[PDB]
C-alpha cells in the first residue's frame, strides 16, 4: 500500500514515473503500461496477421451514436491491446493492421498510459507479487499486477513545503523551515506591519493550520537572474519537499529551470496579475502575505478533495473540478461495455476521425441556443408575485436506433444514478458534493471539459425547455396568469386584489409545486409582491411594489420606473416626462383606490384619465409654444440635440412629438380603456397640425437588440442571457447577483463567435421556392417545377442590419479587437 503524489509518463512509450510515499521518505518508482485500441477492422473476415506480437479479441461495446452514421454495417468491434514500443515502430510501415482496408477508425488511440493509470490504479497502489529486487532495478509492469485498495484516508501529512512565485521582475521565494525572506529586483517596515496584521486578523486560521504549515522572518529586496537556478540546487541538496508555484508562465518556468523536474510538485496557478503603475508595493504585499497564510487553507482543501476523489494530490487544482467528473465518470463507464471517446488537446469528443468531417446537422445543432421567452405586456391592477426557480438543470437530468439525432440512453442512465448518488451524499453533509453538484451544470456547458459531447449538450438544453414548458402548465392550470418567463424569474398574476390575502394562497401553490414529482427538487423563492403594475418589457416597467406581506401592519409600499426609453428623449423634456409618468401613475393608484373603496372590462381603472386631461392639454400648448420659439436659437440648441446610443436606428427631427408618443404609447397598454386613450390622444395631436392615423404619429422601438445566450459567471456557476444594447451601464461588466467584474476580451470574444456564426448560419442557409413555400431538392435547377423562383430563408436586410448594430456597439465602448475583426472583412 503506497500513496502516490504525482504520476507522470516519461519520455519512453509506455513508460511512466511516479514520485510515491514509501513507509519513510519519498521515492520513485519506474512503470510500464500497455496500451489499448478500439477498432472496426473489415466486416468479419480480416487480414489478422497474428504473427504480430498482440492480445486481439472481438468484443460487443457501445458505441457513440454519430448523427452522420446512420448505417450499422459490419459489427465486428475489435478491442486491442498493445505494448506502445511496438505501436510506434509498427506505425513506420504502412502494410500493417491500423492501416489496411475497411479501417472505420480507432476509438481509443488519445488515451495516454498516464491517464489510464490514474484512473484505473488511482492513488492507493500496492502490491501482490508474493522479484521485488528485479522489479525496482527495472520498471515493474502493472497489466499482470494490478488491484487498487482503499483510500479513506491517504497520509499523515508532515512534511516541509516549497514556495516560487512571480509577478509579471517579483519572482518571490519562501521556506517554511526558513527565515529569510529576499525578493528579486519602507518596504521592509510595511512588510512587517502587513504579516503582524494579517497575523492577528487570521489567527484563527493560524491556529487550526499550524499542524499543516507553522512567525516573523527577515525581509530583503535584491545578474540577479541567475539566482533561481542556485537557491532550487540549495533546496534540493538540502531537501527531498513539495513545490507550490503560482505565476501565469507555467510551463516557461519549467522549462527555464532544469531542476523543477526531479520533485513532485502541486500547482496553485491563478494568472491574471497586473500592476496598478502606481503603489504596487502595498498590493504586492498584500498579494504575497495573503498567499503565504492562506497556503495551509489551501493545502487542506486539496487535501480532503484528494482523499475523497481517490487523484494524487499532484496532479489536482482548486479550479479543475471538471477533473474529478471526468475521471469518475469514465471508470464508472469503463466498468460498464461503454467506449470512454476520450479526447486530449482537442474540444471535441473521439469518434474514430469521422468528427473531423464538417457536417449540416452537427453545425446546426452546435449553434442553437437561443432560449426562447413569454412575456404578456399589459396594465394589470390585481396583484402580482415575482419568483425564481433554482437548481432546474439539475432536477430536468434526475427527472426525464430510429431517431439519429437520439444521445446514448445507457449514458444518461449512467450520469442520472451518478448525479442521484451525488445528491444523495451531498444531503448527508458533505461539502465536495454540494460543491460537484453546483459545478456539474458547467462543467455540461464548458467544452474545454473532456468528454464533452454537443449531442447531449442539446439534449440537455431542449429538456430543460420541456420541463420549463410543463412548468408553465402546471402553473396555469391553477388560477394564474404569467406575465413573464425565463430561466430565473418568472411573473404569476394572482386573481386576488389584496396582497395581505395572498399568504396562505401563495403558500399553497409553492406547496403543491414542490410536491409534483416532476418538480421534487426544483428550488423557488418569492421575492417581491405587486399592487399595481405598468409592465410592457423587461427593461421597461414601472409600478408599487411590497417586498413582504407583513401582519397586522400596513405594508410598506414603494415606487419604482426603469424606463431605458427615457433615455432616448430630449434632455429638457425628461423631467416631464418622469412628472407626467409619476401623476399618472398615483391617478391609477388613486381611481383603483376608489373602485375597491365602492365594493374585458375592470371598473378598477376605468375613469382616471379624467383627472389630468386639462392640466396636460395646458402644459403641452405651453411647450409646444415655448419649442417653436426656442429651437431656432444658437445657444438654445444644447438641451434640443438628441442623444445617440448604441442600437439606435430611427431619425427624426422633433422632440415633442417623441415625447407625447412615448406619453400615449404607455397609457395604451392598458388594453381595457382604449376608447378614452385614443380620443386622448386625438385631441392631443390636434394640437399639432397632424391627422389620427398619420405615419409620422406611430410610435416605435427607438432600441434595436442585441442578446448573447448563456454567460457563465464563474464565481456563481450562474447562467443568464445579456442584452449589449437595451441593458444599462454598469450590469454589462457584472453579475446580477454578485457584484464581481467581468473580463472585457471575453465579452469581445464572445461577441466575435456570435458574429461569425451568424455569418456561417447565412452561407449555408436553404432555398425556397416563392409561390409555394417547398424546399430545393435538387443542386442545380432554374427554378421550381411550378411557377415562382427561389429565394433564401434568411433575408440579406437582417444579416445587414446585425452589422450595422454591430458596427454601433463596438463604437460606443472600447472594443478594439472586434473593430479589427470587422475591418478584416
Ligand atoms: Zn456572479
Ligand atoms: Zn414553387
Given at each position: 500500500t503506497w500513496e502516490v503524489l504525482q504520476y507522470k509518463d516519461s519520455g519512453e512509450p509506455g513508460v511512466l514515473e511516479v514520485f510515491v510515499t514509501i513507509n519513510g521518505k519519498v521515492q520513485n518508482i519506474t512503470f510500464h503500461i500497455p496500451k489499448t485500441i478500439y477498432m472496426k477492422f473489415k466486416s468479419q473476415t480480416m487480414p489478422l496477421q497474428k504473427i504480430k506480437n498482440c492480445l486481439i479479441e472481438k468484443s460487443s461495446a457501445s458505441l457513440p451514436n454519430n448523427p452522420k452514421t446512420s448505417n450499422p454495417a459490419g459489427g465486428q468491434l475489435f478491442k486491442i491491446t498493445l505494448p506502445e514500443s511496438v505501436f510506434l515502430e509498427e506505425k513506420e510501415n504502412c502494410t500493417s493492421i491500423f492501416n489496411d482496408e475497411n479501417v472505420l477508425g480507432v476509438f481509443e488511440g488519445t488515451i495516454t498510459p498516464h491517464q489510464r493509470a490514474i484512473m484505473?490504479?488511482?492513488?492507493?497502489v500496492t502490491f501482490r507479487s508474493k522479484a521485488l529486487g528485479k522489479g525496482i532495478q527495472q520498471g515493474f509492469e502493472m497489466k499482470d499486477l494490478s488491484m487498487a485498495e482503499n483510500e479513506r484516508y491517504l497520509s499523515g501529512f508532515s512534511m516541509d513545503i516549497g514556495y516560487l512565485l512571480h509577478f509579471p521582475e517579483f519572482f518571490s521565494l519562501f521556506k517554511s523551515w526558513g527565515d529569510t525572506i529576499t525578493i528579486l529586483v519602507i518596504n521592509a517596515s510595511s512588510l512587517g506591519q502587513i504579516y503582524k496584521q494579517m497575523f492577528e486578523k487570521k489567527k484563527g486560521k493560524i491556529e487550526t493550520y499550524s499542524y499543516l504549515v507553522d512567525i516573523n522572518f527577515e525581509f530583503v529586496y535584491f545578474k540577479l537572474y541567475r539566482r533561481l537556478s542556485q537557491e532550487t540546487t540549495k533546496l534540493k541538496e538540502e531537501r527531498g519537499f513539495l513545490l507550490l508555484l503560482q505565476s501565469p508562465f507555467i510551463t516557461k518556468l519549467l522549462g527555464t529551470i532544469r531542476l523543477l523536474n526531479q520533485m513532485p510538485i502541486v500547482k496553485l496557478s491563478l494568472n491574471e496579475v497586473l500592476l496598478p503603475q502606481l503603489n504596487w508595493q502595498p498590493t504586492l504585499l498584500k498579494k504575497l502575505v495573503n498567499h503565504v497564510l492562506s497556503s495551509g487553507s489551501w493545502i487542506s482543501h486539496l487535501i480532503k478533495l484528494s482523499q475523497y476523489s481517490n487523484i494524487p494530490i499532484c496532479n489536482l487544482r482548486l479550479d479543475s473540478m471538471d477533473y474529478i467528473i471526468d475521471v469518475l465518470y469514465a471508470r464508472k463507464l469503463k466498468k460498464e461495455n461503454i467506449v470512454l471517446w476520450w479526447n486530449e488537446k482537442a474540444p471535441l469528443p473521439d469518434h474514430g476521425g469521422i468528427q473531423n468531417d464538417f457536417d449540416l446537422n452537427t453545425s446546426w445543432i452546435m449553434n442553437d441556443s437561443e432560449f426562447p421567452k413569454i412575456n404578456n405586456s399589459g396594465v394589470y391592477d390585481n396583484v402580482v408575485l415575482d419568483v425564481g426557480v433554482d437548481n432546474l438543470t439539475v432536477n430536468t437530468i434526475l427527472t426525464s436506433e430510429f431517431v439519429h439525432d437520439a444521445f446514448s440512453n445507457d449514458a444518461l442512465n449512467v450520469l442520472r444514478g451518478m448525479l442521484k448518488e451525488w445528491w444523495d451524499e451531498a444531503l448527508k453533509e458533505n461539502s465536495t458534493a454540494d460543491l460537484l453538484v453546483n459545478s456539474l451544470a458547467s462543467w455540461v456547458q464548458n467544452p474545454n471539459a473532456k468528454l464533452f459531447d454537443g449531442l447531449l449538450r442539446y439534449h440537455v438544453h431542449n429538456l430543460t425547455k420541456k420541463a420549463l414548458l410543463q412548468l408553465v402548465n402546471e402553473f396555469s392550470a391553477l388560477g394564474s396568469t404569467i406575465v413573464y418567463a425565463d430561466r430565473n424569474q418568472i411573473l404569476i398574476k394572482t386573481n386576488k386584489y389584496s396582497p395581505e390575502n395572498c399568504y396562505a394562497y401563495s403558500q399553497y401553490m409553492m406547496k403543491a409545486v414542490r410536491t409534483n414529482p416532476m418538480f421534487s427538487y426544483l428550488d423557488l423563492n418569492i421575492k417581491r409582491y405587486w399592487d399595481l403594475l405598468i409592465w410592457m418589457d423587461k427593461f421597461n416597467f414601472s409600478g408599487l411594489a411590497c417586498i413582504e406581506i407583513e401582519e397586522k401592519e400596513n405594508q410598506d409600499y414603494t415606487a419604482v420606473s426603469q424606463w431605458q426609453l427615457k433615455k432616448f428623449l430630449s434632455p429638457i423634456y425628461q423631467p416631464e416626462f418622469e412628472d407626467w409618468m409619476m401623476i399618472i401613475l398615483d391617478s391609477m393608484l388613486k381611481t383603483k383606490q376608489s373602485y375597491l373603496k365602492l365594493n374585458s372590462v375592470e371598473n378598477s381603472l376605468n375613469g382616471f384619465s379624467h383627472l389630468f386631461s386639462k392640466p396636460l392639454m395646458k402644459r403641452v400648448k405651453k411647450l409646444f409654444k415655448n419649442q417653436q420659439e426656442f429651437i431656432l436659437d444658437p445657444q438654445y440648441e444644447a438641451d434640443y440635440v438628441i442623444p445617440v446610443l448604441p442600437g439606435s436606428h430611427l431619425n427624426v427631427k422633433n422632440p415633442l412629438l417623441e415625447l407625447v408618443k412615448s406619453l400615449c404609447h404607455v397609457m395604451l397598454l392598458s388594453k381595457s380603456t382604449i376608447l378614452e386613450i385614443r380620443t386622448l390622444r386625438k385631441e392631443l395631436l390636434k394640437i399639432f397640425e397632424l391627422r389620427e392615423f398619420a405615419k409620422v404619429a406611430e410610435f416605435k422601438d427607438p432600441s434595436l437588440s442585441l442578446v448573447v445566450p448563456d454567460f457563465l459567471c464563474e464565481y456563481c456557476f450562474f447562467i443568464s442571457d445579456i442584452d449589449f444594447c437595451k441593458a444599462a451601464p454598469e450590469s454589462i461588466f457584472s453579475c446580477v447577483r454578485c457584484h464581481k467584474a467581468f473580463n472585457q476580451v471575453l465579452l469581445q470574444e464572445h461577441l466575435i463567435q456570435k458574429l461569425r456564426s451568424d455569418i456561417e448560419s447565412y452561407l449555408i442557409q436553404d432555398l425556397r421556392c416563392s409561390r409555394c413555400h417547398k424546399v430545393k431538392r435538387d443542386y442545380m435547377s432554374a427554378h421550381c417545377p411550378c411557377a415562382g423562383a427561389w429565394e433564401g430563408t434568411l433575408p440579406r436586410e437582417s444579416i445587414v442590419q446585425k452589422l450595422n448594430v454591430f458596427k454601433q456597439v463596438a463604437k460606443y465602448y472600447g472594443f478594439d479587437i472586434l473593430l479589427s475583426c470587422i475591418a478584416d472583412l
Open positions: 484505473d490504479l488511482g492513488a492507493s
